[PDB]
Amino acid sequence: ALSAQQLLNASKIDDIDSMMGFERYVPPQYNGRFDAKDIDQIPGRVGWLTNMHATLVSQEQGISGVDFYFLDEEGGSFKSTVVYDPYFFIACNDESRVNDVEELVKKYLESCLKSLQIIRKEDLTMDNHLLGLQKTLIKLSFVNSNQLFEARKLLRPILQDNANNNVQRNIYNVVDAKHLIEDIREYDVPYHVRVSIDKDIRVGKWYKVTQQGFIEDTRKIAFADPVVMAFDIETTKPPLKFPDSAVDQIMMISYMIDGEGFLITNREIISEDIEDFEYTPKPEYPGFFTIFNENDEVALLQRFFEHIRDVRPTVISTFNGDFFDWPFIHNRSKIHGLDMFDEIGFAPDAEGEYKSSYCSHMDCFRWLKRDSYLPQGSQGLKAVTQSKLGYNPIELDPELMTPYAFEKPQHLSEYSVSDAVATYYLYMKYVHPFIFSLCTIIPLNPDETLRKGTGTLCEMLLMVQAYQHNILLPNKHTDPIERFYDGHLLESETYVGGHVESLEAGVFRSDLKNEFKIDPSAIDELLQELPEALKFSVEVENKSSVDKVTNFEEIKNQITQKLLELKENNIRNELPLIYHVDVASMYPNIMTTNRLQPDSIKATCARKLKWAWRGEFFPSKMDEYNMIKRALQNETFPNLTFDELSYADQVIHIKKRLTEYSRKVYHRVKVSEIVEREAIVCQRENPFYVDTVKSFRDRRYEFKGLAKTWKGNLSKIDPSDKHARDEAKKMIVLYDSLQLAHKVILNSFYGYVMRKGSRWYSMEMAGITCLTGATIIQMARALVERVGRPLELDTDGIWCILPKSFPETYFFTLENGKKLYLSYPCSMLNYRVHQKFTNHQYQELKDPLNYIYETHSENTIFFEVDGPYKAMILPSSKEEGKGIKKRYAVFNEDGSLAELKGFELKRRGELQLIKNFQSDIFKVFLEGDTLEGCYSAVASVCNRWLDVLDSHGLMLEDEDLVSLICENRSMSKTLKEYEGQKSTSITTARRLGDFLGEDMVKDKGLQCKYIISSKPFNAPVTERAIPVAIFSADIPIKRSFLRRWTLDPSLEDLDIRTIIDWGYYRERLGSAIQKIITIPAALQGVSNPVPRVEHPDWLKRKIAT
DNA sequence: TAACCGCGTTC
DNA sequence: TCTTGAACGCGGTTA
């Protein structure tokens, strides 16, 4: 049956792979000893593994196996196949009768079963597993994965009535072979992952394919250089509209192959033959493009296809190729009578992405979305090239794409080529090293390593460890459709996450003094701890000993005297040191310190830790719940009766009906409560999980430290050596990229235990990680409060100021002449966290043969310092007593922007006016020589921006006004999925649809460019919202919609200037100028620097005193 | 006024 | 199907 298609597909894939240079290599037969240490002697072919896919194979029903795609040492390529029987396990609730269920499944599954076997694995949910006791399991093996699925289909009936009550007719009678099946296990492992794990094969490693299997050649390590292609397609476009692969044609396709550029053009659209040209944005990105002017598109497609066949690419990179370019070329190939999969072996898959068997499709957009660590407002190719490649790509407005086909083809070709350059070199210097290296530890191919969620990446890593330690995988987690608490249905339940505080606002600068009030008892405490904390820094922070340090006492006495000056003069007006302290990999290091794992949470090996639980429940109670349901049982349903509907479909009707009843009587739709819960953490459980976290943390620390090394080397580089300065700066962005790309995967080991379908779910374990972190950040803040003035706090980071005279940086001197770095403000914190948050109960197996553990003290929680900074600027809220958190600006000593966070300037969309405003104002806080002077200097910029708005934009030209006044906002789903909701995006989506057709809203992720109107008057802002595109429409079209939209049937004036509700914009900017300058200025004792923006009444009253 | 939502950041 | 988490700002509706 269904095998038919699979066997057919393989023959196809086999022929296309053969066409592209991968043909099955069957290694010679060897009757000599199979050790890895004789690899040179064993006959076989050595190659670099670049790809792997599951296949069926008819012998030399189909047989399951994995094709492996190799690049050989001699410049060629080949594939080799590994067969491996797929398998899962049957768990038994009576291990004395495994025999009987064994003989039962043997008969019952005769149709699909191949072989059967009794095994044993470690089960962390079984008592006495730490003493060597193991769970007995039946290993069912199959010829192919269809047979495996078939057995699952036959077992679940048994699995599902065993859960249901058995019906015994002889009521007067007080166990069957089928009821002994408790569960099946490891039944949902992707086959190629299973082969990849059980066989320890990884893409990116070198092997020698031999008769007895694959032998890793540890003597190579350096990756082979594959043939890499990257392409961009530019197409024709209806004015003010989206390209349609049904109507529109490809104008031109630009690509690059191992550094050499090319360019196809359809002369029917392009209207001019083009000639070889060069686009080399920077020396390190050479771009010589040869051009292939073609007559009809059909020839453009054939020529693109032809090349590919000649080049034999193993990697094809694009930029959003999965959802536009690849599909587009498909529809056009179909329309023009070409089958692309016969032409180049590419075709869409189940999720609609485009893959091939031999060549990986490397969509840079997927990397950027997951691993670039950039905001989504910075993930467009223009901005990515600036951040990561250090140059400005060529910018051409999409509306002018289609006409510039004729007016200036050569210009449009330059832009086409600019997209290709940026895509190839973005892939080659960021994606390709990261993904292929990742494959050497993660059992996926490049295509999957690029696209899988970071949680799944964590899961893959964890499954390797669990298998290699012979640990049985738990089945995927299943959230209950209904959960309750004190008789109330739970809308949602979670834990209290990170702790965040805004404590101050305003301007803080290295040349502008502040008041400090130092707690004298704080100085006493530090001095009591100074000797042991200094030893701590040397012994633990720098892994040395007090014996080889020679200036210990001077540094001590130096520190001691500065501290003593601060104890007497506790009231001081000094220049500040703007510092930031942040725990390195906080949550991971908290899990490793406390030996935290989902499997360590139990109900002395026991380390009791607290977390905070938070639930959201209906104030309704069981009585109300029981009633509403019966009501619902009586309605007829669209399709039916309520009981007829799926349990899920039932409860979702219930939830919508509960929200209404509770509001009527309870009057509150939901109730929030925080319960503190204590969980047991067994300090002796098999540590395979946390060890995986430990390993991946250390993997990241590798790159974070190299970033820090080269950030130091650039300081040593002399200003004149531009090449050196440039390379180091290039190394810094390289390692910052690599270390950030690991950060998300790393922290996903913490997320994973709350993820849906998690094989290792524990709400407790995540809760305890968060609450511990809240305790550590707050004890740190308590001390800096007593000795300085903290500014913002966020989970693990503290921005604070300190008196210039607070002990700062000191350098120990060693017997070796070497020096040890010491930041006193850092090590004073690090000593107290290590004295109050150390796990003295950490246990590990010392002797596995007799199960002897040693108990022990662990702690890897360290603050790290960056600073001192030149300026920090915190906004304040418009509301009394409140602050803005997760938003601020920081500046380095040289005047460069250190960090900008949270602000609209960084986010995607937002109103461009506030973007450009923020872009201009922040840097201005560096001027003036007094705080009052500084606010003045920024006030000048504010009034200038206030001027353009009070002038009703008569001040700057039209094409420049549309940008400043537009607000772009993306829309997660299609508008059809938003009804019952009102927003400026939702309106702009309808009006785009009405005027430009329903096609506009068919695809989600729409980006709604809108200005809001003055009319209708007193109408809600959501309703007075106009797509920008209308103002580029023909005058009759504009008038009809605008008058309709403004609700004035007689409006003749059709100028953007008249319609704009400049009032909205002034309020918006004012709130901006208010929170960033005016209100903050007051909290710093400065009378309103922008008097045209009025204060709030509460501030006026406190200003009034 | 306060609760609640979608989006997109900071952790 | 496949799928890391919680805390937060902001403009906007809604009770």
Ligand SMILES: Nc1ncnc2c1ncn2[C@H]1C[C@H](O)[C@@H](COP(=O)(O)OP(=O)(O)OP(=O)(O)O)O1
């Ligand atoms: N994307 C994320 N997913 C899950 N947890 C996260 C994420 N980002 C941050 N966290 C959590 C876990 C981190 O330990 C904690 C502190 O945030 P942050 O300081 O940005 O990261 P970090 O402390 O792990 O790395 P770093 O060494 O760069 O400080 O916040």
Ligand SMILES: [Ca+2]
């Ligand atoms: Ca393009």
Ligand SMILES: [Ca+2]
């Ligand atoms: Ca951190």
